[PDB]
Amino acid sequence: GGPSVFLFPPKPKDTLMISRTPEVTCVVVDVSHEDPEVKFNWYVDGVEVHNAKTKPREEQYNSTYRVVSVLTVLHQDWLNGKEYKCKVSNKALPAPIEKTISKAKGQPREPQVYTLPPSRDELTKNQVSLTCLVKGFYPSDIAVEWESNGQPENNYKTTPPVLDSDGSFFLYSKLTVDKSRWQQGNVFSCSVMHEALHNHYTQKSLSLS
Amino acid sequence: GGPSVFLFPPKPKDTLMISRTPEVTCVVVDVSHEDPEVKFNWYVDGVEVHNAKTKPREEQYNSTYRVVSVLTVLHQDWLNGKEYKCKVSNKALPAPIEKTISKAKGQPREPQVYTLPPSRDELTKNQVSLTCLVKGFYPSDIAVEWESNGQPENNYKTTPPVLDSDGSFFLYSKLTVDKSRWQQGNVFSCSVMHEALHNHYTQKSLSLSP
Amino acid sequence: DAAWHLGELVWATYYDPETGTWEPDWQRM
Amino acid sequence: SPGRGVYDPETGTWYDAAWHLGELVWATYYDPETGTWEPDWQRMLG
Ligand SMILES: *[C@@H]1O[C@H](CO[C@@H]2O[C@@H](C)[C@@H](O)[C@@H](O)[C@@H]2O)[C@@H](O[C@@H]2O[C@H](CO)[C@@H](O[C@@H]3O[C@H](CO[C@H]4O[C@H](CO)[C@@H](O)[C@H](O)[C@@H]4O[C@@H]4O[C@H](CO)[C@@H](O[C@@H]5O[C@H](CO)[C@H](O)[C@H](O)[C@H]5O)[C@H](O)[C@H]4NC(C)=O)[C@@H](O)[C@H](O[C@H]4O[C@H](CO)[C@@H](O)[C@H](O)[C@@H]4O[C@@H]4O[C@H](CO)[C@@H](O)[C@H](O)[C@H]4NC(C)=O)[C@@H]3O)[C@H](O)[C@H]2NC(C)=O)[C@H](O)[C@H]1NC(C)=O
Ligand SMILES: *[C@@H]1O[C@H](CO[C@@H]2O[C@@H](C)[C@@H](O)[C@@H](O)[C@@H]2O)[C@@H](O[C@@H]2O[C@H](CO)[C@@H](O[C@@H]3O[C@H](CO[C@H]4O[C@H](CO)[C@@H](O)[C@H](O)[C@@H]4O[C@@H]4O[C@H](CO)[C@@H](O[C@@H]5O[C@H](CO)[C@H](O)[C@H](O)[C@H]5O)[C@H](O)[C@H]4NC(C)=O)[C@@H](O)[C@H](O[C@H]4O[C@H](CO)[C@@H](O)[C@H](O)[C@@H]4O[C@@H]4O[C@H](CO)[C@@H](O)[C@H](O)[C@H]4NC(C)=O)[C@@H]3O)[C@H](O)[C@H]2NC(C)=O)[C@H](O)[C@H]1NC(C)=O
């Protein structure tokens, strides 16, 4: 056992927004000096494609190389659940190594999005929590972000998606804002991207009462 | 190569409830039928201790054994930052591999606990969610559960702890109840266990307001 | 119809009179 | 006299313990010294 291979999927935002370029990354490590030559072959659904980029091998601090091949993918094939196959072949590999990956299969379920105001108890602090519950969606690939007056608010943290008991996923996204902004009735918004949503997108807003 | 080792922490609810029993678990995989022979040395802060359970080995349908060792940890020791070392010796290893774990180093911070009602938009459905926001706590080892009328509610999910800007953690717990329970006026409680809380425990109740 | 996120095109669809759905509008994207 | 708990007529000040669903979680006593609840290890490990 010399080399080792890892296939990574595209970023959720990149698969969802037609204007970003989504890509699957194949990464070979423990590439001996003795045998540096590495061949990458890609197949979408068992049919080989040939426009993958192979970044020049870069050198690791433990006397091994690392080589990565990157295949950029069509937003549709990915959302249609097509299968990406990376085959790494090396002169010191008993046989070429195969890793294949893809989006999860399952009828896409649209998320429900709820914004929730800060707890009354929280309104003693000088900063508050604006909350965004997003649940019911499938598969787990989603992206969430907040904004106000068409400007991104950047002091938010979001949860990894959690598996609910009816087999879909939910998550929360917590936006911290200065209390005063909230009390003055500014309006904030939770943006959500997901394939099962119409045009991959929905937005929910909240503000004081 | 050879046998590998994986050392695992106790469950938080175990470390925090004194009336429970925490343990670190040291697993050893890729043991050969050639060398089925495996020793463990446990050390609580460089001091050695000999009370671990060594389970009999299991065959792994991959022509390999797995051998686990389980150390009971004392609540005082664990909470006080002490280090646990697992030393695995196998006649096939150039050196006895060594793994080490412990509670995260850092001042424990008390979480804030807020319950949040179901969103108005949601009260159209026949099932609503109640939300428990737990924020600004350290270390990240916490346990959250729900209840009502001294019975535990079991239709809930809790997210994993998430790092915040000021280096603390937060999470969210979601309980799903029938809308009628909610409108009946039922009181539900979100319970949190964490070390920086007074007596490790806090409950915040939550019920329809107007 | 089309959706925009902070000025960036996200996706766009149209009505396909046959089926009750909005199919991906590739012309526009 | 601080927040909660019960008062021990002896040298010891105040004693508190939390229970989760019948099961004991932990138990502290008040340090009239540093004015903080410190782990009461008597009760617990007993
Ligand atoms: C010598 O060194 C090299 C290099 O290492 C160096 O180490 C020292 C010296 C440091 O100082 C530093 O120099 C280096 O770290 C060693 O090589 C390492 O070898 C190990 C294993 O042998 C590799 O471990 C795997 O790591 C995976 C995770 O890696 C990612 O994250 C880490 C952070 O920990 C990064 O550092 C890595 O680079 C990877 O990063 C990701 O990279 C992607 C592509 O670059 C990113 O995605 C793309 O990104 C762009 C954005 O810019 C676009 O958006 C594209 O669209 C997109 O495609 C990605 O975002 C980025 N991630 C992030 C957010 O960081 C582990 O996942 C993997 O574990 C898998 O395998 C285990 C095998 O048993 C398994 O148990 C695990 O569960 C896990 O997962 C699963 O795998 C199995 C297959 O076995 C599947 O069948 C399961 O179903 C599957 N489950 C799931 C659902 O996951 C490995 O642990 C390590 O990555 C590698 N390091 C590096 C840097 O590459 C080398 O070993 C050393 N030599 C010797 C002699 O030992
Ligand atoms: C031969 O077969 C064997 C047998 O396995 C079987 O065969 C395989 C092929 C399967 O197909 C299947 O048939 C069988 O499973 C193979 O054995 C496996 O070998 C790999 C290594 O190659 C092991 O991988 C590690 O996995 C860890 C996680 O495992 C846990 O989670 C999974 C579920 O996803 C379970 O299946 C496991 O059993 C583990 O479960 C945990 O078990 C603990 C104790 O048993 C529990 O703790 C106790 O729990 C109880 C609860 O009842 C109480 O609370 C106690 O109080 C408590 O102590 C724990 O709760 C439980 N969790 C649960 C619910 O499952 C990984 O954690 C680990 O990852 C490290 O290394 C990876 C690379 O090696 C890397 O990818 C990871 O990132 C990670 O790296 C560490 O990361 C930190 C920071 O993140 C770093 O700082 C560390 O330095 C870094 N380490 C490194 C990289 O140096 C392991 O990868 C696999 O688990 C093992 N199987 C089992 C079950 O033992 C064998 O490989 C085969 N070999 C051959 C010849 O083919």
PDB file of C-alpha atoms and ligand atoms in Angstrom, chain B residues 4-12 14 21-31 55 59-66 68-71 99, ligand 2:
ATOM      1  CA  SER B   4      -3.934   0.924  14.793  1.00  0.00           C
ATOM      2  CA  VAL B   5      -5.329   2.598  17.940  1.00  0.00           C
ATOM      3  CA  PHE B   6      -8.318   4.864  18.606  1.00  0.00           C
ATOM      4  CA  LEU B   7      -8.905   6.488  22.000  1.00  0.00           C
ATOM      5  CA  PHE B   8     -12.424   7.834  22.781  1.00  0.00           C
ATOM      6  CA  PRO B   9     -13.832  10.321  25.325  1.00  0.00           C
ATOM      7  CA  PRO B  10     -16.673   9.608  27.803  1.00  0.00           C
ATOM      8  CA  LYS B  11     -20.212  10.772  27.081  1.00  0.00           C
ATOM      9  CA  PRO B  12     -20.888  14.276  28.474  1.00  0.00           C
ATOM     10  CA  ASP B  14     -21.642  10.696  32.023  1.00  0.00           C
ATOM     11  CA  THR B  21     -20.263   6.266  35.108  1.00  0.00           C
ATOM     12  CA  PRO B  22     -17.913   7.870  32.542  1.00  0.00           C
ATOM     13  CA  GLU B  23     -15.266   5.923  30.673  1.00  0.00           C
ATOM     14  CA  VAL B  24     -12.497   6.368  28.087  1.00  0.00           C
ATOM     15  CA  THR B  25     -12.343   3.577  25.504  1.00  0.00           C
ATOM     16  CA  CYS B  26      -9.194   2.514  23.711  1.00  0.00           C
ATOM     17  CA  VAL B  27      -9.837   0.485  20.532  1.00  0.00           C
ATOM     18  CA  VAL B  28      -7.254  -1.526  18.664  1.00  0.00           C
ATOM     19  CA  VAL B  29      -7.902  -2.744  15.065  1.00  0.00           C
ATOM     20  CA  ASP B  30      -5.678  -4.446  12.367  1.00  0.00           C
ATOM     21  CA  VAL B  31      -4.402  -7.051  14.833  1.00  0.00           C
ATOM     22  CA  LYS B  55     -12.807  -7.209  26.463  1.00  0.00           C
ATOM     23  CA  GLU B  59     -12.763 -11.750  14.751  1.00  0.00           C
ATOM     24  CA  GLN B  60     -13.500  -9.145  12.092  1.00  0.00           C
ATOM     25  CA  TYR B  61     -14.581 -11.042   8.884  1.00  0.00           C
ATOM     26  CA  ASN B  62     -11.598  -9.198   7.419  1.00  0.00           C
ATOM     27  CA  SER B  63      -9.138 -11.714   8.942  1.00  0.00           C
ATOM     28  CA  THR B  64      -8.315  -9.265  11.720  1.00  0.00           C
ATOM     29  CA  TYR B  65      -8.984  -8.874  15.399  1.00  0.00           C
ATOM     30  CA  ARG B  66     -10.306  -5.822  17.277  1.00  0.00           C
ATOM     31  CA  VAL B  68     -11.081  -2.829  23.215  1.00  0.00           C
ATOM     32  CA  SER B  69     -10.043  -1.605  26.684  1.00  0.00           C
ATOM     33  CA  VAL B  70     -12.314   0.442  28.836  1.00  0.00           C
ATOM     34  CA  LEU B  71     -11.149   2.737  31.618  1.00  0.00           C
ATOM     35  CA  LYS B  99      -2.735   7.956  22.432  1.00  0.00           C
TER      36      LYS B  99
HETATM   37  C1  LIG E   2     -10.670  -4.730   9.302  1.00  0.00           C
HETATM   38  O1  LIG E   2     -12.009  -4.538   9.702  1.00  0.00           O
HETATM   39  C2  LIG E   2     -12.040  -3.670  10.833  1.00  0.00           C
HETATM   40  C3  LIG E   2     -13.356  -3.772  11.592  1.00  0.00           C
HETATM   41  O2  LIG E   2     -14.264  -2.805  11.128  1.00  0.00           O
HETATM   42  C4  LIG E   2     -15.315  -3.363  10.329  1.00  0.00           C
HETATM   43  O3  LIG E   2     -14.814  -3.504   8.980  1.00  0.00           O
HETATM   44  C5  LIG E   2     -14.893  -2.309   8.184  1.00  0.00           C
HETATM   45  C6  LIG E   2     -14.087  -2.392   6.863  1.00  0.00           C
HETATM   46  C7  LIG E   2     -16.384  -1.950   7.993  1.00  0.00           C
HETATM   47  O4  LIG E   2     -16.767  -2.180   6.652  1.00  0.00           O
HETATM   48  C8  LIG E   2     -17.321  -2.719   8.956  1.00  0.00           C
HETATM   49  O5  LIG E   2     -17.479  -4.048   8.514  1.00  0.00           O
HETATM   50  C9  LIG E   2     -16.756  -2.802  10.380  1.00  0.00           C
HETATM   51  O6  LIG E   2     -16.828  -1.529  11.016  1.00  0.00           O
HETATM   52  C10 LIG E   2     -11.673  -2.247  10.435  1.00  0.00           C
HETATM   53  O7  LIG E   2     -11.780  -1.489  11.616  1.00  0.00           O
HETATM   54  C11 LIG E   2     -11.950  -0.075  11.426  1.00  0.00           C
HETATM   55  O8  LIG E   2     -10.727   0.577  11.168  1.00  0.00           O
HETATM   56  C12 LIG E   2     -10.777   1.993  11.033  1.00  0.00           C
HETATM   57  C13 LIG E   2      -9.340   2.488  10.831  1.00  0.00           C
HETATM   58  O9  LIG E   2      -8.842   1.997   9.604  1.00  0.00           O
HETATM   59  C14 LIG E   2     -11.522   2.666  12.213  1.00  0.00           C
HETATM   60  O10 LIG E   2     -11.731   4.046  12.029  1.00  0.00           O
HETATM   61  C15 LIG E   2     -11.683   5.002  13.095  1.00  0.00           C
HETATM   62  O11 LIG E   2     -13.044   5.385  13.221  1.00  0.00           O
HETATM   63  C16 LIG E   2     -13.310   6.232  14.312  1.00  0.00           C
HETATM   64  C17 LIG E   2     -14.802   6.353  14.580  1.00  0.00           C
HETATM   65  O12 LIG E   2     -15.281   5.061  14.868  1.00  0.00           O
HETATM   66  C18 LIG E   2     -16.397   5.351  15.730  1.00  0.00           C
HETATM   67  O13 LIG E   2     -17.596   5.654  15.018  1.00  0.00           O
HETATM   68  C19 LIG E   2     -18.125   4.617  14.173  1.00  0.00           C
HETATM   69  C20 LIG E   2     -19.502   5.029  13.655  1.00  0.00           C
HETATM   70  O14 LIG E   2     -19.336   5.883  12.554  1.00  0.00           O
HETATM   71  C21 LIG E   2     -18.221   3.259  14.887  1.00  0.00           C
HETATM   72  O15 LIG E   2     -18.430   2.248  13.931  1.00  0.00           O
HETATM   73  C22 LIG E   2     -16.944   2.955  15.683  1.00  0.00           C
HETATM   74  O16 LIG E   2     -17.088   1.799  16.473  1.00  0.00           O
HETATM   75  C23 LIG E   2     -16.602   4.109  16.609  1.00  0.00           C
HETATM   76  O17 LIG E   2     -17.662   4.238  17.540  1.00  0.00           O
HETATM   77  C24 LIG E   2     -17.416   4.780  18.841  1.00  0.00           C
HETATM   78  O18 LIG E   2     -17.013   3.708  19.663  1.00  0.00           O
HETATM   79  C25 LIG E   2     -16.547   4.152  20.923  1.00  0.00           C
HETATM   80  C26 LIG E   2     -16.086   2.967  21.751  1.00  0.00           C
HETATM   81  O19 LIG E   2     -16.250   1.774  21.023  1.00  0.00           O
HETATM   82  C27 LIG E   2     -17.661   4.889  21.662  1.00  0.00           C
HETATM   83  O20 LIG E   2     -17.172   5.346  22.898  1.00  0.00           O
HETATM   84  C28 LIG E   2     -17.647   4.808  24.145  1.00  0.00           C
HETATM   85  O21 LIG E   2     -19.013   4.710  23.755  1.00  0.00           O
HETATM   86  C29 LIG E   2     -19.946   4.280  24.757  1.00  0.00           C
HETATM   87  C30 LIG E   2     -21.354   4.239  24.122  1.00  0.00           C
HETATM   88  O22 LIG E   2     -21.913   2.950  24.249  1.00  0.00           O
HETATM   89  C31 LIG E   2     -19.829   5.110  26.080  1.00  0.00           C
HETATM   90  O23 LIG E   2     -20.260   6.463  25.998  1.00  0.00           O
HETATM   91  C32 LIG E   2     -18.385   5.179  26.580  1.00  0.00           C
HETATM   92  O24 LIG E   2     -18.383   6.037  27.705  1.00  0.00           O
HETATM   93  C33 LIG E   2     -17.447   5.641  25.433  1.00  0.00           C
HETATM   94  O25 LIG E   2     -16.072   5.584  25.792  1.00  0.00           O
HETATM   95  C34 LIG E   2     -18.237   6.036  20.836  1.00  0.00           C
HETATM   96  O26 LIG E   2     -19.382   6.581  21.445  1.00  0.00           O
HETATM   97  C35 LIG E   2     -18.620   5.419  19.514  1.00  0.00           C
HETATM   98  N1  LIG E   2     -19.292   6.368  18.646  1.00  0.00           N
HETATM   99  C36 LIG E   2     -20.334   5.920  17.919  1.00  0.00           C
HETATM  100  C37 LIG E   2     -21.741   6.210  18.394  1.00  0.00           C
HETATM  101  O27 LIG E   2     -20.164   5.249  16.893  1.00  0.00           O
HETATM  102  C38 LIG E   2     -12.698   7.587  14.012  1.00  0.00           C
HETATM  103  O28 LIG E   2     -12.963   8.454  15.104  1.00  0.00           O
HETATM  104  C39 LIG E   2     -11.182   7.479  13.747  1.00  0.00           C
HETATM  105  O29 LIG E   2     -10.775   8.615  13.014  1.00  0.00           O
HETATM  106  C40 LIG E   2      -9.447   9.132  13.104  1.00  0.00           C
HETATM  107  O30 LIG E   2      -8.477   8.718  12.164  1.00  0.00           O
HETATM  108  C41 LIG E   2      -8.969   8.765  10.850  1.00  0.00           C
HETATM  109  C42 LIG E   2      -7.896   8.145   9.987  1.00  0.00           C
HETATM  110  O31 LIG E   2      -7.405   7.054  10.728  1.00  0.00           O
HETATM  111  C43 LIG E   2      -9.362  10.191  10.462  1.00  0.00           C
HETATM  112  O32 LIG E   2     -10.119  10.106   9.268  1.00  0.00           O
HETATM  113  C44 LIG E   2     -10.221  10.886  11.531  1.00  0.00           C
HETATM  114  O33 LIG E   2     -10.247  12.275  11.340  1.00  0.00           O
HETATM  115  C45 LIG E   2      -9.706  10.624  12.932  1.00  0.00           C
HETATM  116  O34 LIG E   2      -8.492  11.338  13.105  1.00  0.00           O
HETATM  117  C46 LIG E   2      -8.219  11.807  14.434  1.00  0.00           C
HETATM  118  O35 LIG E   2      -8.795  13.106  14.426  1.00  0.00           O
HETATM  119  C47 LIG E   2      -8.380  13.996  15.469  1.00  0.00           C
HETATM  120  C48 LIG E   2      -9.109  15.336  15.307  1.00  0.00           C
HETATM  121  O36 LIG E   2     -10.377  15.165  14.692  1.00  0.00           O
HETATM  122  C49 LIG E   2      -6.847  14.130  15.395  1.00  0.00           C
HETATM  123  O37 LIG E   2      -6.298  15.084  16.303  1.00  0.00           O
HETATM  124  C50 LIG E   2      -6.269  12.721  15.569  1.00  0.00           C
HETATM  125  O38 LIG E   2      -4.865  12.728  15.605  1.00  0.00           O
HETATM  126  C51 LIG E   2      -6.703  11.927  14.353  1.00  0.00           C
HETATM  127  N2  LIG E   2      -6.042  10.639  14.267  1.00  0.00           N
HETATM  128  C52 LIG E   2      -5.112  10.464  13.326  1.00  0.00           C
HETATM  129  C53 LIG E   2      -5.550  10.709  11.881  1.00  0.00           C
HETATM  130  O39 LIG E   2      -3.941  10.127  13.601  1.00  0.00           O
HETATM  131  C54 LIG E   2     -10.713   6.199  13.015  1.00  0.00           C
HETATM  132  O40 LIG E   2     -10.372   6.482  11.656  1.00  0.00           O
HETATM  133  C55 LIG E   2     -12.855   1.961  12.457  1.00  0.00           C
HETATM  134  O41 LIG E   2     -13.583   2.521  13.545  1.00  0.00           O
HETATM  135  C56 LIG E   2     -12.524   0.501  12.697  1.00  0.00           C
HETATM  136  N3  LIG E   2     -13.713  -0.221  13.050  1.00  0.00           N
HETATM  137  C57 LIG E   2     -14.072  -0.374  14.315  1.00  0.00           C
HETATM  138  C58 LIG E   2     -15.547  -0.388  14.620  1.00  0.00           C
HETATM  139  O42 LIG E   2     -13.232  -0.486  15.203  1.00  0.00           O
HETATM  140  C59 LIG E   2     -10.232  -2.329   9.974  1.00  0.00           C
HETATM  141  O43 LIG E   2      -9.832  -1.085   9.490  1.00  0.00           O
HETATM  142  C60 LIG E   2     -10.105  -3.353   8.858  1.00  0.00           C
HETATM  143  N4  LIG E   2      -8.717  -3.393   8.361  1.00  0.00           N
HETATM  144  C61 LIG E   2      -8.368  -4.105   7.259  1.00  0.00           C
HETATM  145  C62 LIG E   2      -7.155  -5.027   7.335  1.00  0.00           C
HETATM  146  O44 LIG E   2      -9.037  -4.053   6.207  1.00  0.00           O
END
